[PDB]
């Protein structure tokens, strides 16, 4: 990884952009000539290969955290996978040519970058990145970071550990599919239960759920079984706190949290991806892609529309970029 010739890195590129808050179907526009971000000293520039969408992208675009957002206009997209093309003077972990992936924004809700991953090139902090596992495609790798890190962090916050039981509310989405796999294969849960609708129960079982609960037919909180950990990924903490054992832990990623449940917002860290590398290399934890993935870079508006339906199974990914 010698530096790229400087004239080989463009100063403008194609990206999706919005200049005012609103629905993606109204505000999200293709711009054939936006600035490539200049990197800071602790960042790398990446040639984006694939990007995933997350609900935060559209909630952000609606203006839900405008008071702590970065200035408009915005190029959306948190998740990235691609190839390093430039490294800042303080970077030590990556060199030009490294294949990398991560969630760009250390703090999702406070000063996320203006220059997101739905662009041909993007700038990323060294600290949010990890080396792409050789056995994963760029589509697969881009699908992972925000969701798998949120799954991981919520399970750690809930103190999950070997032999304990866990109930996952929303097992079939970007986050939930990882909550199940991590709980079973990384945290050593003795029993993993999870909720989804009728046609998604077999998927939950395939990912490691011992008990798949159809929420459209029955109410988990009325079951006599109670769990050491309940991880709410839907926003049902009122009910979640009824399913936990005394002294157990309930976490949510959708607020507000009814005590004793806690809400948190993930911190994006490349070190989490690195910790999980061996599970990703062995296939014990797999990426989960929605059957409609990938969407071409021309179809980003459609990709958001599908995500906004709340029906995605695993991840919506954009490729080729
Ligand atoms: N606080 C944080 O750090 C953080 C980080 C990431 C995400 N989030 C938030 O967490 C939530 C989940 O994000 P995500 O990326 O996993 O979303 P996602 O992929 O859009 O979730 C879609 C899935 O949700 C399932 N679902 C919807 N309502 C359900 C219910 N009542 N019960 C069980 N399953 C249900 C759907 O399955 P069915 O079709 O079977 O309903 C679908 O498979 C979002 O609100 C997001 O904004 C928070
Ligand atoms: C990615 C971060 C998220 O944080 C909150 C509170 C959401 O709803 C998100 O999607």
UniProtKB/Swiss-Prot annotation:
<dbReference type="GO" id="GO:0102978">
    <property type="term" value="F:furaneol oxidoreductase activity"/>
</dbReference>
<feature type="binding site">
    <location>
        <position position="253"/>
    </location>
    <ligand>
        <name>NADP(+)</name>
    </ligand>
</feature>
<comment type="function">
    <text>Enone oxidoreductase involved in the biosynthesis of 4-hydroxy-2,5-dimethyl-3(2H)-furanone (HDMF or furaneol), the key flavor compound in strawberries.</text>
</comment>
<dbReference type="GO" id="GO:0008270">
    <property type="term" value="F:zinc ion binding"/>
</dbReference>
<dbReference type="InterPro" id="IPR013154">
    <property type="entry name" value="ADH-like_N"/>
</dbReference>
<dbReference type="InterPro" id="IPR036291">
    <property type="entry name" value="NAD(P)-bd_dom_sf"/>
</dbReference>
<feature type="binding site">
    <location>
        <position position="59"/>
    </location>
    <ligand>
        <name>NADP(+)</name>
    </ligand>
</feature>
<keyword id="KW-0560">Oxidoreductase</keyword>
<dbReference type="Pfam" id="PF08240">
    <property type="entry name" value="ADH_N"/>
</dbReference>
<dbReference type="Pfam" id="PF13602">
    <property type="entry name" value="ADH_zinc_N_2"/>
</dbReference>
<feature type="binding site">
    <location>
        <position position="215"/>
    </location>
    <ligand>
        <name>NADP(+)</name>
    </ligand>
</feature>
<keyword id="KW-0521">NADP</keyword>
<dbReference type="InterPro" id="IPR011032">
    <property type="entry name" value="GroES-like_sf"/>
</dbReference>
<feature type="binding site">
    <location>
        <begin position="174"/>
        <end position="175"/>
    </location>
    <ligand>
        <name>NADP(+)</name>
    </ligand>
</feature>
<feature type="binding site">
    <location>
        <begin position="311"/>
        <end position="312"/>
    </location>
    <ligand>
        <name>NADP(+)</name>
    </ligand>
</feature>
<feature type="binding site">
    <location>
        <position position="59"/>
    </location>
    <ligand>
        <name>substrate</name>
    </ligand>
</feature>
<keyword id="KW-0520">NAD</keyword>
<feature type="binding site">
    <location>
        <begin position="197"/>
        <end position="200"/>
    </location>
    <ligand>
        <name>NADP(+)</name>
    </ligand>
</feature>
<protein>
    <recommendedName>
        <fullName>2-methylene-furan-3-one reductase</fullName>
        <ecNumber>1.3.1.105</ecNumber>
    </recommendedName>
</protein>
<feature type="binding site">
    <location>
        <begin position="264"/>
        <end position="266"/>
    </location>
    <ligand>
        <name>NADP(+)</name>
    </ligand>
</feature>
<dbReference type="InterPro" id="IPR002364">
    <property type="entry name" value="Quin_OxRdtase/zeta-crystal_CS"/>
</dbReference>
<dbReference type="InterPro" id="IPR020843">
    <property type="entry name" value="PKS_ER"/>
</dbReference>
<dbReference type="InterPro" id="IPR044626">
    <property type="entry name" value="AOR-like"/>
</dbReference>
<comment type="subunit">
    <text>Monomer.</text>
</comment>
<comment type="similarity">
    <text>Belongs to the zinc-containing alcohol dehydrogenase family. Quinone oxidoreductase subfamily.</text>
</comment>
């Amino acid at each position: 990884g010698a530096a790229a010739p400087s004239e080989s890195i463009p100063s403008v590129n194609k990206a999706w952009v919005y200049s005012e808050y609103g629905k993606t179907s109204d505000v999200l526009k293709f711009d054939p000539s936006v600035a490539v971000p200049e990197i800071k000293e602790d960042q790398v520039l990446i040639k984006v290969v694939a990007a995933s969408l997350n609900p935060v992208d559209f909630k952000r675009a609606l203006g839900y955290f405008k008071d702590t957002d970065s200035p408009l206009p915005t190029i959306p997209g948190y998740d990235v996978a691609g190839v390093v093309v430039k490294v800042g003077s303080q970077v030590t972990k990556f060199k030009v040519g490294d294949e990398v992936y991560g969630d760009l924004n250390e703090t999702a809700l406070v000063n996320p970058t203006r220059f997101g991953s739905l662009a041909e090139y993007t700038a990323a902090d060294e600290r949010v990145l990890a080396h792409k596992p050789k056995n994963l495609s760029f589509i697969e790798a881009a699908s992972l970071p925000l969701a798998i890190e949120t799954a991981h962090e919520g399970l750690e916050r809930a103190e999950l550990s070997a032999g304990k039981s866990v109930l996952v509310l929303g097992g079939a989405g970007g986050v939930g599919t990882h909550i199940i796999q991590l709980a079973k294969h990384v945290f050593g849960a003795s029993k993993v239960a999870a909720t989804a609708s009728t046609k998604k129960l077999d998927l939950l079982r395939t990912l490691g759920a011992d008990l798949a609960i159809d929420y459209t037919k029955e109410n988990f909180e009325d079951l006599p079984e109670k769990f050491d950990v309940v991880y709410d990924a839907v926003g049902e903490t009122d009910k979640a706190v009824k399913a936990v054992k005394e002294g157990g832990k309930v976490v949510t990623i959708v607020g507000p949290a009814t005590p004793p449940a806690i809400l948190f917002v993930l911190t994006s860290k490349g070190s989490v991806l690195e910790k999980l590398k061996p599970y990703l290399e062995s296939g014990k934890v797999k990426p989960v892609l929605d059957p409609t993935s990938p969407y071409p870079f021309t179809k980003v508006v459609e990709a958001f529309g599908y995500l906004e339906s709340s029906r995605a199974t695993g991840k919506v990914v954009v490729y080729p970029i």
